[PDB]
Every structure is written in structure tokens, then in C-alpha cells.
Amino acid sequence: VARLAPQAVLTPPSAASLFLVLVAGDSDDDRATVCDVISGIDGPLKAVGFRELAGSLSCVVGVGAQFWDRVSASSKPAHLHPFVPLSGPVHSAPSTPGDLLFHIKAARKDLCFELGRQIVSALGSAATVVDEVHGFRYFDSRDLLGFVDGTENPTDDDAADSALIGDEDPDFRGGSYVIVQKYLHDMSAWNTLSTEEQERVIGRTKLENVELDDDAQPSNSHVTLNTIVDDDGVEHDILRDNMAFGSLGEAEYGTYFIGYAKDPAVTELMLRRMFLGEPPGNYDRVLDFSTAATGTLFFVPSRDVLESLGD
Amino acid sequence: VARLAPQAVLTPPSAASLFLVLVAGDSDDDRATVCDVISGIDGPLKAVGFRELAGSLSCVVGVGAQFWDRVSASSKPAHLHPFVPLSGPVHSAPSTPGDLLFHIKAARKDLCFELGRQIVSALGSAATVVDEVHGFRYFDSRDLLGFVDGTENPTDDDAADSALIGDEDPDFRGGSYVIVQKYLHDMSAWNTLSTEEQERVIGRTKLENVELDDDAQPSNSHVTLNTIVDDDGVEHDILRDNMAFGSLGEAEYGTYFIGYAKDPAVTELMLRRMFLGEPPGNYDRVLDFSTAATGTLFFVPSRDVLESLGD
Amino acid sequence: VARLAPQAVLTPPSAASLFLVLVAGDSDDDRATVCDVISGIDGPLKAVGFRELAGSLSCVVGVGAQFWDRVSASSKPAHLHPFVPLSGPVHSAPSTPGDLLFHIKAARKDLCFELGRQIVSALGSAATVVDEVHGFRYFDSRDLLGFVDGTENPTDDDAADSALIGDEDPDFRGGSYVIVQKYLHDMSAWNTLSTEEQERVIGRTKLENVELDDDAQPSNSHVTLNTIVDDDGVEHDILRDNMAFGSLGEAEYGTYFIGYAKDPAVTELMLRRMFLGEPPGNYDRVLDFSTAATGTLFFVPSRDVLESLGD
Amino acid sequence: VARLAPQAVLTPPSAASLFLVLVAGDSDDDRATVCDVISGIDGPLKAVGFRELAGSLSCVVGVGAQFWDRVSASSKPAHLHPFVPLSGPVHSAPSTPGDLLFHIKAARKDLCFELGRQIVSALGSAATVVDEVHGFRYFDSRDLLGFVDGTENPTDDDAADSALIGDEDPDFRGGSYVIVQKYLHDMSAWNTLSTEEQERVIGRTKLENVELDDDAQPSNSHVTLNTIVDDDGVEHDILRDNMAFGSLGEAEYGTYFIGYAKDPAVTELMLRRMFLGEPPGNYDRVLDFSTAATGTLFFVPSRDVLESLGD
Amino acid sequence: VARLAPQAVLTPPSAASLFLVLVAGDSDDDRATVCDVISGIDGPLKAVGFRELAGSLSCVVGVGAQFWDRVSASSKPAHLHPFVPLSGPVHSAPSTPGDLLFHIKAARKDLCFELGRQIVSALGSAATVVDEVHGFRYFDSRDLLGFVDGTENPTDDDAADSALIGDEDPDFRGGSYVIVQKYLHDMSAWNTLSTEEQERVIGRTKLENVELDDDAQPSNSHVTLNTIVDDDGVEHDILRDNMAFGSLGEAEYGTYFIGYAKDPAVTELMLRRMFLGEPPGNYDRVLDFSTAATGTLFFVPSRDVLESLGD
Amino acid sequence: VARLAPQAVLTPPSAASLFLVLVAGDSDDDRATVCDVISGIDGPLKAVGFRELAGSLSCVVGVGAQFWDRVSASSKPAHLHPFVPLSGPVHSAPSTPGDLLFHIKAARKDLCFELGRQIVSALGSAATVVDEVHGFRYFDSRDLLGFVDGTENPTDDDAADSALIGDEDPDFRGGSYVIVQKYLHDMSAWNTLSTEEQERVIGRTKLENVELDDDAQPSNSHVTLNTIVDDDGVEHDILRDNMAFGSLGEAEYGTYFIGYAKDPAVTELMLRRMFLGEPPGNYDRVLDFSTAATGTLFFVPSRDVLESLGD
Numbered sequence A, B, C, D, E, F: 001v002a003r004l005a006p007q008a009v010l011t012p013p014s015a016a017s018l019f020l021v022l023v024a025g026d027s028d029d030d031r032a033t034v035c036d037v038i039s040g041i042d043g044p045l046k047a048v049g050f051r052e053l054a055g056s057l058s059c060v061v062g063v064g065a066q067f068w069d070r071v072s073a074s075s076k077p078a079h080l081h082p083f084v085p086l087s088g089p090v091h092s093a094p095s096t097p098g099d100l101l102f103h104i105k106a107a108r109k110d111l112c113f114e115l116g117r118q119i120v121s122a123l124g125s126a127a128t129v130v131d132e133v134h135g136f137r138y139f140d141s142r143d144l145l146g147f148v149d150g151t152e153n154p155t156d157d158d159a160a161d162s163a164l165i166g167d168e169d170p171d172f173r174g175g176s177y178v179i180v181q182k183y184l185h186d187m188s189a190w191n192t193l194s195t196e197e198q199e200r201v202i203g204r205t206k207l208e209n210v211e212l213d214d215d216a217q218p219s220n221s222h223v224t225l226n227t228i229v230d231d232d233g234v235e236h237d238i239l240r241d242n243m244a245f246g247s248l249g250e251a252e253y254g255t256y257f258i259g260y261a262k263d264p265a266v267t268e269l270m271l272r273r274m275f276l277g278e279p280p281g282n283y284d285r286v287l288d289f290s291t292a293a294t295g296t297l298f299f300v301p302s303r304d305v306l307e308s309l310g311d
Ligand code: HEM
Pocket: A143, A145, A147, A148, A149, A150, A151, A152, A153, A181, A183, A202, A204, A222, A223, A226, A227, A238, A240, A255, A257, A259, A267, A270, A271, A286, A290
């Protein structure tokens, strides 16, 4: 695992996270300020992270397609475009604003909050926060629906192969594409279901986190709809880093979805299967209890490309 | 230190906290529901807290004067009354609503959040959250002004002597009185000051957390104004458990003040010295950078008295 | 919590345990050896436990009624007798041999195993192991049935009041009475039940460990049958320290029950309600999935009384 | 170090382990079930291991020569054969049954036990456990003979070079060969020896774990007999992961030997030197205090090869 | 265990310590400065210690007999006098200067060093350091002779009864008497001995830390000479907190002895038995390998008495 | 990160360290002893380090230019020479003796001290310690001047690229060049300065560890003088591992500087800029508060080259 290195996509789950999404100002000065801050993001990452012996603090910067075109008009990753909104038969995935993403993780909340503070300070009037979630780990790697969340993530070389751009787009080798969606749950509706009904919605057993048998696995379970098999029988993964969040006084119980892929075609096909259904109409039952409030796609440059921005 | 015991006021600082303030509904049914939940608060405390081997989870329930009169009309602690608002020459301490306080602490946020979830679920329509703060520890026991915060707290027997009702009100022995105030900081104004100017505002050195020498200690420093000396030369302490909180996108940088005392006369005199000044006008410089958004006083019953509520 | 002190009944749950039950030889020399080892048990406890900085190692010695009569013929705790076997309408609680119990706990298995090794070495031919279980903590304080196990234990002063002999038998003040039963589960039968059926067997929700509502709580749930209410409405607790154990190759999935009480009348009434039923026949559903292989009652002397044995 | 990846041979020592050895049923259906479970072993490994933030859980699957021939008749690693039994002048190394090995390690026993439970459940009637040991770390990396055990293991690239198949058998690159032997000790005989006599048996000092000087090192010490030097003066290592186990009531004090090598010729030569002696008759003194109850050799396929099994 | 409370004698062993011994200047101003610093020692203790969440930092202040007479001429503990030097047949225990002792302990060296820095700064020219040792824990609670050191310490109530002044000197109830001696070892001479010879010098087995059998225990072992039995057969303990220290380049391998007792008669009798021998001449063999460079006795006032000093 | 591998330069910061510098004896026998010990340094490293489960212990051996010429007369790294002393306008960097460096790090002091003990024992009369510092981490990665120290270190591949010899000197690929300097501080002079004056001396803010703005950054700050930019605008880093040390009774407050580089030209240019100034005379203000007592340069051989020494 990388130590205090920007753009460390492959880091393991953490106890705390911060997801910041910002819009950049329209002026040339604002664009220059944003590029200065993000290209030098190793500065604040080390300024905060070096203070913890374990060096758990990580920070991944994503850049939206529209802002990318403002700063790197003549060179662009092959599949960078704004999040494509989905209108399913029942549920929809909106496309909401965002020019910059900071995906910050650490063993402690203070490290995440302080790095966010320093970044927001440095950006000043050049950018505006449009979404902010301070995520926390919930029991034994569970989400607020009470299921272990992240089990089938690829790890190690499989994670690198699934998440990072390779030979297919060599100018951007080592970058990634990340999609975020902030989901809010209907906990009263969810906790109406029996455990076995919930297991059929997800596709795994609840306490024990075991995938349902083939002959028990619904065609519209979350697991089935998010399993991506090509014509050669090869499976394709994304790398997810979801975290819980919420407010008891707003009855807000949330899962913040974040998913990295070497090609957003994989993540986008998962989203189509979830929202539109496979076959069409046979959509993901998780969406009957979970509403996406945001949806934004970013390019994650390699460190070399990030350092170059604004030049 | 107590293990999974309601009303454990003397617990040491923690990495995470939750401060919930609620108003109770006006109906007899709502009053009964509230009394049922709080008198049996050991249930949810153990249901959540037993799941962590260390047993770090604690929960202190406070009850406001007005709600107290609804449920225990014939027996009342000697000094229970609503928070008295202060109108200083420059700054004010408002008195804001609250019938119930839950002061929850643990080594992890999930334990605090889950206990809060279970309590809010159990109360249902009988109470409404009016303030909610998820506090976090910031570096080496610091607040967001960058000073170590809690240093001079009494510990052990001194803490018991300072915080818990004794022989002076024997029907309520082992209870306490707690005041909360949610403060928001003007960080841009604060970080205009030099370190030495900030040290003179607080009354201690910043990195090293050492009290200023007598000949360097201002008469309006926070330390001076919060030092309470009686005519016999005896000092009187309160027990504080402040925590950081905030939102980067709202430029909200907060200190949640919580202070326990065996007699609210001590806490109230501190507040008068801070807001009104000693001499009058010579008010606490911390308030030039910190604004109180809430102010609420609660009685913390002993476990025996808490268990009795609603009977 | 006590540090390296024999007879520390009130210790919190641990990650590892060892339960040893032995029978003493019939000779005077064997009796003397046993008394020498147990009266000086602080020796091995410190010899092993001092090697861990945290000092997590504890050791409680219990003595059976028959062996007690061999060594302290003229002075006996008021309620010491052999475990009374129960023959229920379906399930039975056998009374099985044991003169000595060592209930050993620590943060690590090696400390438990090494203390057991040293004790068995010291006893030599004077005693014979008749039951041995190396217990382990399972996830978030669960037993192998998948429920959090220990939630409603009394803690702190409530634990002392429930577990330790007081004014009622002053010659034995600070002692306790402990019952052990080694249970083996029918996991295939258990995992036939739905989650909700299992919750009705136990009396709490499974993942969330919340007691069922009064109007959902069966009369034959484990929680109902193990709730002991006297005529004055006062509840009576025992202090339990159960641990998981097993062998995959023997399909042995176990819960080792251990329960301390100041008067075995409480534990015995719980057992009658479980095995015989209340009303008679309405027995504890946990026993349809759990079979007791052992049942033995011991007196736990205070340290002062333990040190005196053999004199 | 790998995270939740099957066939992770190079993992560092752990606090807990589980060694399971099974025989597969004779039927085609049983063979298919076994291949299904082992080829998809990443499923249970993640189902259990993802629940611990640290991701300490590992699982290495070994396959015996006879079972290998049932499932991969046309492609076989160069040196796969059943364990060759040794008959020394005094001690013998038996060859005992085993078609499947699961070498499971984690920071906690529950993770090892739960993964074993899930694997045994999935195999059902298709395989039978023939050996099962739950290993534990003993003090500062010691075995039950009281010596630090594992000191001279190769680490990092040396470990990869020693344990993993390379260019010499490219169809099986990244696999390994593992031998297990379950040893039981005669502790009363061992603890007759002086410390210095024990140091001469092992070849290192006891408390300090320092190799004996050349002029003090016996020709039949364990260290000498297990040092493998080729004609070019190059040394050859194996990668060992021994753990303690035992039962106090059976006077069973055990060391579970497990050793990985890229070519079983190295491990086999060590065993010959130990049991037969070098020169013949000059056998390893450790065997005067340690008796091998099992002896079984397995091929450890790379992940790619493991995933392919049963196809 | 106490939290951030001066004069906490009963604290468990720690990973790091600092032993500071100082002489006070002769002037009235120097005496006043010393009394100001020590009576207010809770200030620096909290200033440093509050910065660690665990609150592991402790500080015990001792005051020498001569300095005591300068500051509290009309009230003195019953047994306060300067360390009495011993001249044995072979080895001697010198009496060396010291007016003030700070016995500082924590989980980390930085906390000990920083508290020492702040104390030395505050004392300035009013006192001079005459001995300074930064102690460290060595493996599993061992000293540099390789034996576990501290095993038979009293704990909990036994520690309070052994270390703290009670009804016998009520004006000083809760105080203690502490002796320090800095020992340097002859490691080359020690490591000439066999393990069994070393075990006979100490009185316990080396790796396993078990007291030798009565029929194997020499009359001049350290354990025998430091066992104090009165005419009624009652044993008397002291509370020790030894730590390792040293310098590789000076061939300095040290044990810092520190021992607390409610009456220095116990510690003094141990020292006589060690240095003079029982019978006379039969002195402690540890002293053939260990030379005392310092010897100083201090009174440890209760917190109340300490706070009063200089008034 | 490497596990128990000699010459592991890239290891992250640790809680404890030991820096040993020795001079070798002049005789052929002494040279042979030194080569035997250092070429086999993996022996003691594993003998000590394997005893800690985490395997935190590391040991890097450096060899001085003069000793190198005694043992490897026909093959030498391209830039190995003795430390070049600097005589600045105010401050000087002396060149002081040293043939061998051991840079030892671990999570605990005992591991560092014990490895040092074993190395010094093995060297015996063949080498003499000339400098010895036991370093400790101070708060949140700070030095005794109160600044976070190490922030801008390169990590991961940047660290390898900065510290390790590559294609430019292929016979020594994987080696490094290390310079040590032991600095003592004038704390009374330092703590005269305001925080802002100290920030201008260092080039970063003190509590928050943020680099000063370009328009606030002095030309003679430590950060400016230690920033190395080539004509192509490429920056060049060194890898530093400084630690605090000191003695309160000697008023010795120290920073032990240790810096690794693939070519000592980088470290030497930093030192020239610090001591001589850029422009000449504009020297580093840190040196007005910090005096170098030692200065020594060593070659750090790769493991392969180290193992070969003395052959
Ligand atoms: C409310 C939002 C969501 C919730 C509560 C949720 C929950 C879960 C859970 C409990 C699992 C099973 C354990 C695991 O393997 O991680 C899972 C699996 C998975 N989820 Fe989600 N998820 C959410 C949103 C999404 C979205 C938006 C995507 C895709 C764009 C996604 C992709 C996946 C994938 C790829 C798997 C692994 C399936 C497999 O191969 O077994 N999830 N999710």
C-alpha cells in the first residue's frame, strides 16, 4: 500500500472518510488557482498525514469532463464524459454538478477533516463545495442496511487490473474513472422486510455475508445485476469504497457509493442493469429502499498527469 | 471507570461523541413514552455497547426543568431551572429549547451513531430532535482553535467531588447538573492573530499547553475568567467534555461545550464572568471568535432516580 | 478491574478463556497437594500474567461440595451442594463430576494455556482433568448460534451485588457460587429456522441484539425464562461469561456456559424454568438446539478463604 | 503482503491458525464438489475476511498427488508425489492420508474457525476431515519446547525465491509444495535436560535465540541438520509457519510443522538428514522429544491454476 | 488506576519511565521555588499528560529528609531519615545525595521526557539534577539479567496495604517511603554462569519465571533474602517498579531499583539481608553481578500534604 | 515495506531508533571480525526481530570510505569519500570519525537496544563505539524545536528513486550514501523567538506544518536552502529519518540528522547551502540554534554487496 502518495486508488477500506465535491469558478484566475492546488496536492496530504505515524491518510483527486476541457483542451482520456443520467421504470439516477472530487480516507476523522480544511482554505473563492459527506465504518464492514458492503471487491493485482488504465490508453496509464452517488435509505420500509426478503434483495446472507446459492439467487438481486460477464465468460469488476453517513434528526441514513474502474463502461453497465433492469423492467430491488441524490463522474489522473495540470 | 452503566458522568475523554437534544411532545402518552425509554436506557446502552469488547460506550441522560416538572412534580433537585440567558456588552448566551439530553461517547463513531439510532427509534413521535452534533477528537486533545482543550479538568475523586451531588441534596445524591452550548468559530478572524495574541486570549501556551505565568496572564483570558475562587481561597471546578465538529462546505468550525457540576451556581458564575466580564465589561476574548448558538441546562439523575422516572 | 488477583469474579469479557474441571485423588497426600496448589494460586497467576504488560490474565478457582467437605469439614458456605440434575419433559441437565474448577481468562490464548500448563504440572498425580475447553470470542461478542451473548449481564456494583456473597453469610463474604454446563449445538437444525423464528427462540433480534417488544416476546423465549422477578418486583441477575468452542471435524459447535451468583438459588431457578418449563412443559426453545454434556456447581472462596485452605 | 487473496504463501506469522486436512470421496460428484469449492475459495475467504478491517485472514489450499491425478490427469507439476515415509534408526516419519489442505491464518481465532466452518459446510459429504489443528502463537514467537521458532525463515524476495515455482516448471509458476507433520512432545523428558543441553539439541541459545558459535554447534543439532548447502556453496531455504497446539488433559503438547518450498527435494533432504542422520545414524536430537503423528505432501497451485480446477 | 493525579504510587508497570533526582539550592528563594513547583505538580502533569487520550502519564514526587526539615520543620512523617549506608562483607550500598525525586511513567518516552523538561525548566537555578535515568521495558517484563522482574509485586488492595501509610501515622495517611538505587551489571561475569546457576542466584526459573521448589531454593537467593516474615508468620511486601537502562558504548547495562513501602523498615531489612547477609555473611548473589551506584530515601507525601508544601 | 531484511533504507518512521557509529581496529584480525559481523548481519537482525510479531525491527549498515578501502580495494562506489567539513561564515560542520554505522529502528526501544547489544558483543575488541544515540519520536512527528520533522520526505517509488543507486553505478545498484550529524540545540535562545520568527527560520507554520506562501518564504529559511532545483527545473530529494534525543541534567536537547541519497552530491549541496549560504553568507537560520557535533559519510551497500564483504 502506498504511503502519503496522491492518487492512491488501491488503498484498503478505512475507519473514516471524507468525500468532497466542488464546482470551480468560471474565471481564468479561478482555473489557475484550482490547478495550482490540485497539481500540488502532495503538499497538504503530507502536511497533515505525516503527523500520524501509521501514515493512513490518502487523497484521490478526480476532475470532471467539463473542467478537464478547460485545462487540458488538447489531451483527454478516451472515455471522459459527464455522468449519463438514467431514467428507469421506477427509479432514476440523476447527473449532478461537480468539477473536482477529493476522496480522502484515514484511520481517524480528524486527519480527514483537517486535510479537507486545508484544501478548502487553499482553494478559497476559486471553488465552491456542492457535496460533502463524512463517512464512517459501521460495525464489521457493514452499510446501514445491515449488510457487509465491499466483500467481493477485487484486491491487489486484480484491483489494479480492474481500476487502473493500462495499455489501451497509454497517455493516461495509471489513471482511473470514478463515479459517486450519494444514497439515502428508507429505513422504515427496509426494516418491514424479513431477513430472508432482504437477503433476496441483496443476493447474500445478512449476518454471515455468504452469496446465495445459484438456485436461490434472484435475477434482480443486487449481486446478479452487478455481475458483469463478457461474451468470453470473463468477469469485470469495479473497486468500491462505500461508507455510511447520516443525521438522526433528519432521519437521514445514507450509503455513499464510490466506484473506480479503468473504463467507465463497466460501472455504467452496472448502473443500467440496476436502474433500467435486465431484462428491461427487472431492476435492482436495493433501489426500492435507496434513492440517489447525486451522480457525478470524474477522471482520476495518475500522479504524473495530476502534477502537470495547469502547465 | 464504569462499564455500560447509564449516568456515568466521570468517564474520560473519548475519540467520538454524540450530543442529542430533544423536545418531548405535549401529550400524556408522549410523556409516558419518554419516561419508559429513559428509565430503561440501560437496555439500548448494553444492546449496542456489549458488541465492543472494550465496552467504551457511555450514555448520560439529562432532563430539563420544564419536563422534570411534568414527570416528578413533588420531588425536585435543589437547583434545577431553565438555562438563564446572558446579555453581555458585546456577546450573548441564548437559552434554547431542550427537554432531554443524551451525551453519548465511545471509541468509535458507529457505536455512538447506532445507540442514537436505537434511542430515536424507541422515542418515535414522542420526541423531536432539536440539536444534534457528532463530535470528534482533534489531534492531541485540541479544539479547532488549535489549543489543547480539557487540560485542567478535575479527575478521579476531584471529579466526583466537583460534578456529583452529595450530602447537600441527599434525595438526589449522585446526580449532576449539565449545561451545553454549541459554539461556532470565526476561523478567519482567529487566524489573523499571532500565536502570542491567541495565547493571551486563552491563558496558556498553544503548542505546549502550559498556563501563562502570573505576570503574563491577562485579567480577561479564558483561564482567568473561568477560575472560580471562594472567600476561603478554595477553588471550584467543573467537569468539561468538549468536542470538535463542523462542515467545510458551510464554513462551520465548532466547539461543542458540555460542562457538569454538582451545583449549576459554579457553571453559571463562569458563564457570567465570560459573557458579562469581571469587572463588568472585561469579558472573555474567546467570545470575540466564538458564538453560542444554543444554551440549555439539564438535571442528570443518578441511575436510581433515572430508573424511577415515570412511576 | 483487579490486576493479577485470584478469585476476580467481576472481570469483563475476554478474547480467550480456559475452563478446566478436575477430580481430586482420594488420598490424604492428594488432598494436601490440591490445597497447596489452590491456596497459593497467586504464584502461577503472577508467574504467567506478569509477563504481559496489560495484566489481562485472571484465574478463578471453584471447589466442589464433596471436596469442600474433605478439607473444611467444620465451616461451609450456606448453600454449597452438588449440582442438582434436572429431568425435563424433553431435555435434561446432567450432574457430572468435578472437585476443582479453574476459570482462566486473558487477552491471548498463550497466557491461558501456559497458566493451565503450570497448574496441571503443579497438581501432578493429585488431580485428573475431566473437562477442558479453550474458549474463544466469536465476532462482536456472539455465540455460535449467531446471537450476541452476554448483553444483559450486570456490571460494576450491580455485578458485585448479584455475584458476591454479602451480609447474609458473613463468614464467606466475597465468595460466589458458580455453575458450568458445556453445551453442544445442532447447527443444521438451527440454521433450518428463519431469522425471525430464531429471534423468538432467544427473545432478542439477531443482528441488532435488541430485546423483543413485550407484545412480541414469547413466554418460552430464553430471555423470558431467564428473567427472575421476586414478589416485590425486584429482579435478580447472574453474571455469565460464556465462550464459543468447537471442532470442525467432529461437527462440534459449542457454547460453554458459566454463571456466577451470590446464591445458587437464582441460577437453579433459571435452570428449572429452562429445562422444566414455566408453566411446567413450557421449556426453553434454546434446548431444542443445545444439549448440556456437563453440569457442575462450585463454591468460589474469597481470596482470604482460598489462602486458608488446607490449614 | 497480499490482501484476501487465495494461495498467499508468503504471509508473515500470525497469532492464530487452522490446519485442516481432508480426504475426498471416491465419486465423480464428490470430485466435482471438491473442485467447485476449492476453485472458488476466494468466495468464503472474502465472506469472512472482509469483516475485519485489517484483512489479516489468509487461506492456502494444497492438493495431494492422488487427488491431483483424478482432476488434472494431463498436466502435473514436475515434483508432485505422495509424502515419502522415512524409517530412521530410532525415529520414523509416517506418510498419512490427505487429499486437501487448508492452511488458514489470521489475527484472531474466530476468523480462522469461521472460514473453516464455511469451507466444511460447503464441502458437505464430499470430503472428510482427517486432521485438524487450531494453532496459537506462544509468547515471543516460541514453540512449546520454549525456543523461538521461525527465526531463520527467508523473507520478502528470498521467501519468494525459496517457496515459489519459477522458470524451471513454467506451467506451474507461482505454485509451491508444502509438507505438514503434526508433532507431539515428551515435555517431561525435555524438561529433564539442562538449558545448555537443550541449546545443543536445537543449535541456538534459548532465551536469546542466537545461533551457537561454529565451535559449539553440534553436528546433530537441528540447525546443522536443517542447513542445506549445495556443491557451489549456495544455501537453500524453506518457508516454515509452525504453530503451537495442545490439550492439557491429554498431556498433548504439540508443534504443527508446515514447510513450503519451490521443490520438495529441499524439504525432503532436510527430513532425511533429521530422521536418517548425517552421517547415517547421526539423527536430529529434537526427534528424541518429538514424535510425528502425520506426514503429508501437497501441491499448492497458483491462483490461476486453482481457479481452473474441475474445468 | 488514577488518571493524571500526582502521587499515584499504585500504578501498574509501564513501557517507559524517567527517574530524576535533584538537589535543591541552599537559599530561601530556591526553597520557595522548589515548593512552588512541587506543590503545583498537577499543572505540568496535566499539561503534558492530557495530550495522550489514554492518560498513561504519572508523576510521583519524593522529598528527602534534609529538605523536608527545611520546609516542614514542625511536622514530619514518623520514619523519615536519610538512606542508611550499608557496608557488607563484600558489597556496599552507598548513601548518595538527593532532595527531590520525580518518578515519571508513561506508555511513551516522549511524554516522560517532556514532563521532565517542563519540571526542570520550572525549577531553573533552584535545583540541580544529580541522577537521571530514562528507563525502558525489556521484552516480557524482564531486567537486563534476563529474568522477569516484578512478578511477586503486591497488586490492588495488597499494594495499597503494603505501600501507603495508614492509621499508624494518621497525619501522613496516604503517603509512602521510597528508596532508589541505580545498579550497573557485570554482564560478562553473569553470562559465564549456566542458566541453572543464574536461577539459583535469583530464586526462580529463567524463561518460565516460576519460583524454585522449597528443596531447591538457596538460603542466599534473592527471593529468599527479600522474603520478609514476621513472628506471627505474616509476610511483608514492598512495591517495586524497576526498569532497564544503559549505554552500549560505555558497556553500561543497568537495573534502576525503586521500591515503595508504608514503613521503610521493610525495605531496609530487605537491604540488610541482601548486603549484610542472613546469617551474616550469607549475602545476595545478585550483588556479585550488580553494583549500586546510588542510594537515596524519600518521603512521598499524599496529594493533600504535597499541595500544602511551602505554605 | 521489507521484513527483517538488512539494508532496508526505505522503511517508514518509527517510534524508537538507535544510531551507532564505530571505528574498526587496525589489525587484519579486527578487519576480518568486522567483515564477518556485518556481512552476516541478517543473523542478529532476525534473532531479535523475529521475537516481535509485527517485525518492525530494521538495521541498515553503512561503511566509511577509509574502511571500505581496507576491505574492497579493487571495487568502490563512484562517490564514496570521507565527509567534507564545512567552515561557514558563522557555523561549521565538522568531519568526525566513523568506519561503521548501524541505523536501527523499531516500534520499541528494547528491540533496538537488544540488537545493538548483540552487535557490540559480536564485534568485541574489533571495533569501538564513538557515537551512540537512542532516538525517540516526539509527539506528532516533531523534533525538539517543536516542528513536524520529515514532512516533505519522498515516499514509495520517489523514495527509491531519490535514495538508491541505479543504472548510473550498476556494480552498486541498490546501495545508498548516508550522512549523519548529531545536533544539539540552544533551547533558551530558540524559545526567545516568537512563533512567527521560528516559522520564518524553518519555512513552515509550526502547529499546522504548512509550507509558507511564496511571498512569505525567506531566502534563508531551512526549506528554501534545502530545496534543490536543477537547470531543467527538476527537484532532487533526500530521504531523512531524524529523531529526538537528550539529557535533561546536561541541558542536552538534540536532533539526530540522518539523510540517505543515491548520490551524496545532493546532500552535500544542501549542507553547503545551509552552512555557507546562498548567496554566500545567507546561511540557514536553524544553525543559529543548532550545533553539529558530528559529521560522517557512509556507503550503504546493497544486501548482495554487504553479504560479499570480507570475501
Ligand atoms: C444504496 C447503494 C448500495 C448499497 C446499499 C449496496 C450494497 C451492496 C452489498 C451489501 C453488496 C454485497 C457485498 C459486496 O460484495 O460488496 C454489494 C455488492 C456489489 N455492489 Fe453494491 N451497493 C450499493 C450501490 C452500488 C452501485 C451504485 C453499484 C454499481 C455502480 C454497486 C456495485 C456493486 C458490485 C459490483 C458488487 C459486487 C457484486 C458481486 O460481484 O458479487 N453497488 N453492494
